[PDB]
């Protein structure tokens, strides 16, 4: 997730070169830099790429033939359009769920820019994960717990031995620090039911037109045995 | 006689509800795994089936 459009070219100087010295301060921090061509050029790289976060136009162009068909493919996506002096908003762009950021065309603050780029992005990932997944991206880079279970403590066992050293280098270092078992707080535990779990089963079920829906950790083959064992006591008749 | 019972225990449930600051109503918690915060009655304290139920500060129903 790291690719940023640019779509449009007015011409004039005054609005290019804000976007040469914004090219050269967004590759700093590991973003891809798109070219797309005219209206349907932007519109095959986000179908096709899934990976994009942001769209830089001209808000005095294409105010309505942009806002429309980005609202009826994605909701939350940043928008980082670029308004003017005499620029407002339409009647009918009151009932599409879209994130606009406006900027100017300030020469010498593209540095601050780009920060408010990352800030954003980083805004998306928070929102679009559930709060379980969230948990566990944030426990891998800040929580360094010890005497926990399993006993491979995020692939500490594997670097002792050579051939331990193969099978920790083929998955990578996210992997094994994510596979953590209920010797957490900030997660809660599943057989327990609370804490960040407790909204996780409340989220699938409002997804999914739910009441409270499940996650079984051993398969459908399993789930069919839970739920026949409810409703069929030691002597009863099934349909 | 059943229209001056009724006198009698209106009476006597008039000085029960005065002192019912003592004697509140615990009810037990068992929130386990279901939509919604099921509750239940007390065990072998209460067995009636059409049992009375007081309040402290009277409102206007009806
Ligand atoms: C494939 C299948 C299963 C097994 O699914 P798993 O999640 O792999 O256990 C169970 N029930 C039905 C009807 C299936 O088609």
């Given at each position: 997730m790291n690719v940023i459009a640019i779509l449009n070219?007015?011409?004039?100087?005054?609005?290019?070169?804000?976007?040469?010295?914004?090219?050269?301060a967004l590759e700093r921090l590991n973003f891809q830099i798109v070219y797309p061509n005219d209206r349907d050029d932007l519109?095959?790289?986000?179908?096709?790429?899934?990976?994009?976060?942001?769209?830089?136009?001209?808000?005095?162009?294409?105010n309505l033939?942009?806002?429309?068909?980005?609202?009826?493919?994605?909701?939350?996506?940043?928008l980082y359009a670029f308004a003017n002096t005499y620029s407002t908003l339409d009647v009918s762009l009151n009932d599409l769920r879209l994130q606009i950021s406006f900027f100017e065309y300030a020469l010498g603050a593209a540095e601050d820019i780009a920060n408010k780029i990352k800030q954003t992005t980083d805004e998306y990932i928070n929102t679009i994960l559930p709060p379980l997944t969230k948990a566990l991206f944030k426990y891998v880079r800040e929580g360094k717990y010890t005497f926990c279970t399993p006993?491979?403590?995020?692939?500490?066992?594997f670097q002792k031995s050579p051939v331990g050293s193969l099978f920790y280098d083929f998955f990578g270092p996210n992997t094994m620090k994510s596979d953590i078992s209920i010797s957490v707080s900030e997660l809660g535990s599943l057989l327990d039911?609370?804490?960040?779990?407790?909204?996780a089963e409340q989220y699938i079920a409002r997804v999914f037109?739910?009441?409270?829906?499940?996650?079984?950790?051993?398969?459908?083959?399993?789930?069919?045995?839970?739920?026949g064992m409810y409703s069929a006591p030691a002597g009863s008749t099934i349909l | 006689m059943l229209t001056r019972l009724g006198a009698i225990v209106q009476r006597h449930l008039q000085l029960q509800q005065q002192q019912s600051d003592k004697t509140a109503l615990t009810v037990i918690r068992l929130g386990g795994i279901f939509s919604r915060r099921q509750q239940y009655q007390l065990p072998v304290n209460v067995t009636a089936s059409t049992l009375t139920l007081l309040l402290q500060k009277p409102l206007k129903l009806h």
């Open positions: 070219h007015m011409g004039v100087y005054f609005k290019e070169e804000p976007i040469r010295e914004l090219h050269r519109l095959k790289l986000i179908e096709n790429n899934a990976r994009l976060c942001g769209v830089i136009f001209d808000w005095d162009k294409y033939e942009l806002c429309e068909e980005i609202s009826k493919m994605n909701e939350n996506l940043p006993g491979h403590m995020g692939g500490t066992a039911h609370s804490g960040p779990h407790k909204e037109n739910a009441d409270r829906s499940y996650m079984v950790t051993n398969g459908t083959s399993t789930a069919n045995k839970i739920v | -």
